[PDB]
Every structure is written in C-alpha cells, then in structure tokens.
C-alpha cells in the first residue's frame, strides 16, 4: 500500500501534434474559401478574421515552427494574403499579423518561397497602392530579408567569422601647460592581430563560519517583524 507521504509527493510530482498542425492548415484553407464565397455574395468576409487569433496563437509556438513550415503553412498564408475576387486586400488585421508572423518564421527555404508563392503574395502587397505604409515597410523588409539569401548576402554582422574580418582588414590595407593634459585614445587602425602574451585556510574558515551559524538564536518560523513579506 502507498503511504500518505508518497501519495502527497507523487501527486505534486505528477505536475511535471503534427496531426493538429495539418488540421489547422486544413481549417485555414476552409476559412479562406468561405471568405471567397462570402465576398462573391458581397457580404463581410468574417471567417478568416474570426479564425486569425487561434491561428496566430499557434504559429508562434517555437517548438512547432518546423512542423508548420514543412506542413504547408506558407501555402495557407499565401492564400490568406492573396486578394479576393473583387481584388480587394484582406482585412487589415490579417496583413498586420501575417506579415509580422512571416518575420518571425525565418526558417523558410528558397524552394519553399518559390513553391508556395508567398514571395509573390508579399511583393504584391509591397507594390499595392491601398496598402498602409507600416505594412509596406514590413513587406519591404521581408522582401529584402528573403532575397538576400538568393544573392548569398547576409545581414547578421555577428555572422561573419573572425578570419574573414582579419583577411578583409589586410585586403583593405593601404600602400606648454600648467596642468596634466588628458591623453586621448589611439585612433590607430589595428590590422595585425597580436600573439598572446602567454584550501587549508578556507576549510577552517568554513568550519568557523559554521560554528558562528550554529551559535545563532534562530527560530523555526521567521516572524514578519513589520508586516513585510507577510504570507498569504
């Protein structure tokens, strides 16, 4: 039989998906198609905008971003960013959140952009005249961010190796007073990288510290003297 102590300990100890991602993408396609039908009926296309919170709250899950990208999220986002039958842009919220998500979804490979058409779908919004300036800036930076890899460029300055900088620095090398005067830092351009210039007491002190601790007039429950850190 279990002891009440072990029941308590086990009870407290007891406190410590690709299929649902696929189903989410299916629901995103259903929502965008229903909004196409509603737009043809000249009704408000609420389905995408009604699902948006649930979708955004899941695309942010760091542990699933690979699953999301590999499951065809880029295709669904392209469908949501695409203009409707009357060539109107999607709800402002959809553009704002999906563009922000795409910035936070950097693992996207070139083949993924080319196959999903998400690049076309964002370049479209970047060119589009009815797009707001903030969305145009997001689309612009997305287009730069996604095109740099095509040209092998990169924007992470911490990404260039040490030897690359040392080599580049060699590639770029050219051919009275009455009081103390504060000297100013050397402006010299350093090219060349310099070669490097290369207990019995604490046991007794710990023992004495332990004796000091042992001598204290401590109490089992720390009484709040002035009401600070009062429990519950």
């Amino acid at each position: 039989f279990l002891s009440d102590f072990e029941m308590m300990l086990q009870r407290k100890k007891s406190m410590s998906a690709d299929d649902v991602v696929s189903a989410m993408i299916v629901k995103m396609n259903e929502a965008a198609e229903e909004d196409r039908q509603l737009n043809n009926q000249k009704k408000p296309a609420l389905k995408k905008l009604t699902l948006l919170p649930a979708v955004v709250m899941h695309l942010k899950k760091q542990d699933l971003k690979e699953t999301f990208i590999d499951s065809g999220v880029m295709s669904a986002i392209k469908e949501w960013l695409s203009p409707l039958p009357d060539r109107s842009l999607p709800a402002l919220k959809i553009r704002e959140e999906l563009l922000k998500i795409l910035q936070e979804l950097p693992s996207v490979s070139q083949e993924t952009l080319k196959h999903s058409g998400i690049g076309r779908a964002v370049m479209y919004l970047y060119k589009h005249p009815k797009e707001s300036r903030s969305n145009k800036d997001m689309a612009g930076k997305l287009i730069n961010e996604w095109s740099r890899p095509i040209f092998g460029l990169t924007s992470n300055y911490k990404g260039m190796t040490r030897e690359e900088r040392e080599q580049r620095d060699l590639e770029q090398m050219p051919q009275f007073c009455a009081r103390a005067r504060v000297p100013m830092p050397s402006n010299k351009d350093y090219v060349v990288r310099p070669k490097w210039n290369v207990s019995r007491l604490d046991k007794q002190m710990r023992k004495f510290t332990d004796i000091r601790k042992k001598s204290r007039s401590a109490h089992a429950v720390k009484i709040s003297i002035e009401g600070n850190k009062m429990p519950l």
Partner: protein, 40 residues
C-alpha cells in the same frame, strides 16, 4: 521559459498544459529612462 509550447491548444476538430509559446524569456534591465531586454 514560456512552458507548454510543445502542444497545440486548439484541437482544430481532431491535466492541461500551460499552452505557452515555448520562447525563452528576456531579463529586462533599466538604464535611467530606457528599458533593455537581455537574453542569456
């Protein structure tokens, strides 16, 4: 860490986790009137 990032909360028609995003949280620091976020 924003725990429970491993699970889809909405079942999309298919005891409860925290349902977080799994992201590591920044430690925020104040410098006079400006706020800075630092990730370890």
């Amino acid at each position: 860490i924003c725990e429970g990032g491993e699970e889809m909360d909405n079942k999309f028609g298919v005891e409860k986790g925290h349902g977080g995003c799994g992201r590591y949280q920044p430690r925020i620091r104040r410098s006079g009137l400006e706020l800075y976020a630092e990730w370890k």
